[PDB]
């Protein structure tokens, strides 16, 4: 029996359930995993290092959750001292962190070479802070290499009580460069209401272009901007036309709304599908430490956070570098990953808008 | 509602083979896993084994060479074949159907049936 | 293995009294239990889960707490429905080893 802690944010319910549909399908024969399940806050640190010393008192041997812009270094922190790995689905951060692995690839050099492909000089980049500055410092490292014009602005800034005549401002200011090119980097919340505020004031007619940054790209909706004329690329990470995702969603859409919220839709979010991959990643280390009879058994007597010093315990050095020899096949396709924690030798698809829907143009990787 | 159902034999003879089938309803059998459990009279309830979803079978380190399960998700049926019947197999078998819900939890079990293996 | 045991083999009590049904596990299990009843014709439903919460489809009455080693249930109030046989299951380490049961009974 092995056990581990899980966080997860408060709201997080499509992410939950499809945990739970992780953790029944890739049951295994050998062992059984046994996750702690705290759902707690993401962007309060105090009650992430509350939930983060909880299960480190029972003595876990992995941790999966989500982390906050504003408590990523807090994770990296925390995870690097008592060298105990981090398995998350949330975005990259900037730097080679241990005990870090991560689910997203990235997507930075993909706007970078969807930009080159469209052969482009000046465009808006409408972005949101709650993701680190990454993609912004890579765009515009590339505009000062290549002498673009990016019109960069955040939009995060912006509260939901007086969100209509700032949007309104805000577009109204792009019109005095007639900019007719919007690249849009925000979460699954913000860009839907910056459509529809954008369908409200009338900028999605054949004349505009706009790209949705995020991997779930089929998980806005779509629907009120299919027939405006304005061409939407973006980038998609679960490939629907795989026998695998074709039957994971035969298996998904059948499930009860009561039984897991969030989950009888035709598609699924991208966090949902890594926290489905990761539940994979983390029982092929497991059954591969039960294969090469690596005896790690302890009790849940790891003792306080807090300890001086916090002497590490050197078998988890051993399953971080378990968990770059994982290489499987899940929703996002090909998993392998580096000494790092990153992720190598995957696969984008670069999803175009069309009148009867989404219809892929091509793929993208890394060494290619 | 959930309702699930197991029937058997009853009467077995020594040293023979024994199927019991487990018909559940009110849910699908395609994401959900089974679990068999025994039950003896005056005695602690012992665990069998048990099925997944998706194909994985694990059962108990005393028996794991006499207990067998099939399944039907067109019919919802589960059928346990258990050989190598000793006198000290009349006992009651149950199935229930396995969840998570922070915890592997057992949430909708079966009547079960009595089985008496005698001569 | 993990040994569950239940000290409790018969308990009485009347209708709307608040009852208490306590079980003690080998080692700790940190609070991965489940609580189930089943009736006198042998069919069991489950009643709370993860020792503290409460399932779909089962009434507000019933209650769990405890930690460590030592799980309860509690009832606000036994009802006709509520005559039944409840057992504690632990999921810790395969095999996961049930508990002994209490079996509920009318005070006259």
């Known amino acids: 029996s092995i056990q581990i802690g899980g966080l997860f944010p408060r709201g997080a319910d499509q992410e939950y359930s499809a945990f739970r549909v992780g953790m029944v399908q890739f049951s295994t024969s050998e062992f059984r995993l046994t996750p702690h399940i705290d759902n707690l806050e993401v962007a309060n640190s105090f009650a992430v290092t509350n939930a983060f010393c909880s299960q480190f008192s029972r003595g876990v041997y992995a941790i999966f959750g989500f982390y906050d812009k504003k408590s990523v270094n807090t994770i990296t922190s925390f995870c690097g001292t008592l060298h105990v790995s981090f398995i998350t689905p949330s975005f990259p951060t900037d730097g080679t962190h241990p005990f870090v692995i991560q689910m997203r690839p990235d997507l930075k050099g993909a706007l970078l070479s969807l930009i080159e492909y469209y052969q482009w000089d000046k465009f808006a980049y409408l972005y949101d802070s709650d993701r680190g500055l990454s993609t912004l410092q890579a765009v515009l490292d590339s505009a000062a290499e290549k002498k673009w014009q990016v019109t960069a602005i955040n939009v995060g800034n912006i509260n939901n009580d007086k969100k209509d005549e700032t949007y309104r401002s805000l577009f109204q200011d792009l019109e005095l460069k007639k900019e007719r090119r919007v690249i849009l980097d925000c979460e699954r919340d913000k860009v839907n209401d910056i459509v529809d505020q954008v369908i409200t004031i009338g900028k999605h007619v054949k004349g505009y272009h706009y790209i949705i940054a995020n991997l779930g790209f089929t998980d806005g909706d779509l629907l009120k901007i299919q027939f405006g004329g304005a061409n939407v690329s973006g980038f998609q990470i679960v490939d629907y036309d795989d026998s695998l995702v074709s039957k994971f969603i035969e298996r998904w859409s059948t499930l009860e709304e009561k039984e897991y919220p969030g989950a009888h839709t035709a598609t699924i979010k991208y966090t949902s599908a890594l926290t489905y991959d990761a539940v994979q990643v983390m029982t092929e280390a497991f059954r591969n430490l039960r294969k090469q009879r690596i005896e790690i058994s302890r009790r849940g007597n790891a003792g306080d956070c807090l300890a001086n010093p916090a002497v590490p315990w050197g078998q988890g050095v051993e399953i971080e570098r378990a968990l770059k020899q994982v290489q499987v096949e899940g929703l996002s396709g090909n998993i392998k990953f580096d000494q790092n924690g990153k992720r190598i030798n995957y696969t984008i698809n670069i999803m175009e808008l069309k009148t009867n829907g989404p219809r892929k143009i091509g793929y993208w990787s890394e060494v290619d | 509602q959930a309702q699930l159902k197991e029937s058997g034999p009853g009467l077995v003879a020594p040293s023979q083979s024994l199927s019991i089938t487990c018909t559940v309803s009110g849910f699908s059998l395609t994401n959900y896993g089974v679990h068999w459990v025994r039950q003896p009279p005056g005695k602690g309830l012992e665990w069998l084994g048990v099925?997944?979803?998706?194909?994985?079978?694990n059962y108990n380190s005393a028996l794991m060479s006499r207990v067998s399960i099939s399944k039907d998700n067109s019919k919802s049926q589960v059928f346990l074949k258990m050989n190598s019947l000793q006198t000290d197999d009349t006992v009651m078998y149950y199935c229930?159907?396995?969840?998570?819900?922070?915890?592997?939890?057992?949430?909708?079990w079966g009547a079960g049936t009595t089985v008496t293996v005698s001569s | 293995e993990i040994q569950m045991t239940q000290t409790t083999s018969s308990l009485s009590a009347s209708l709307g009294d608040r009852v208490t049904i306590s079980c003690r596990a080998s080692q700790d299990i940190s609070n991965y239990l489940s609580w189930y009843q089943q009736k006198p014709d042998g069919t069991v439903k489950l009643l709370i889960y993860?020792?503290?919460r409460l399932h779909s489809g089962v009434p507000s009455r019933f209650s769990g707490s405890g930690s460590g080693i030592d799980y309860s249930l509690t009832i606000n109030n036994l009802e006709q429905e509520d005559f039944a046989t409840y057992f504690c299951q632990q999921g810790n380490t395969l095999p996961l080893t049930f508990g002994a049961g209490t079996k509920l009974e009318l005070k006259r």
């Open positions: 099925i997944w979803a998706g194909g994985s079978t």
């Open positions: 229930a159907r396995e969840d998570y819900d922070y915890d592997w939890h057992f949430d909708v």
């Open positions: 993860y020792t503290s």
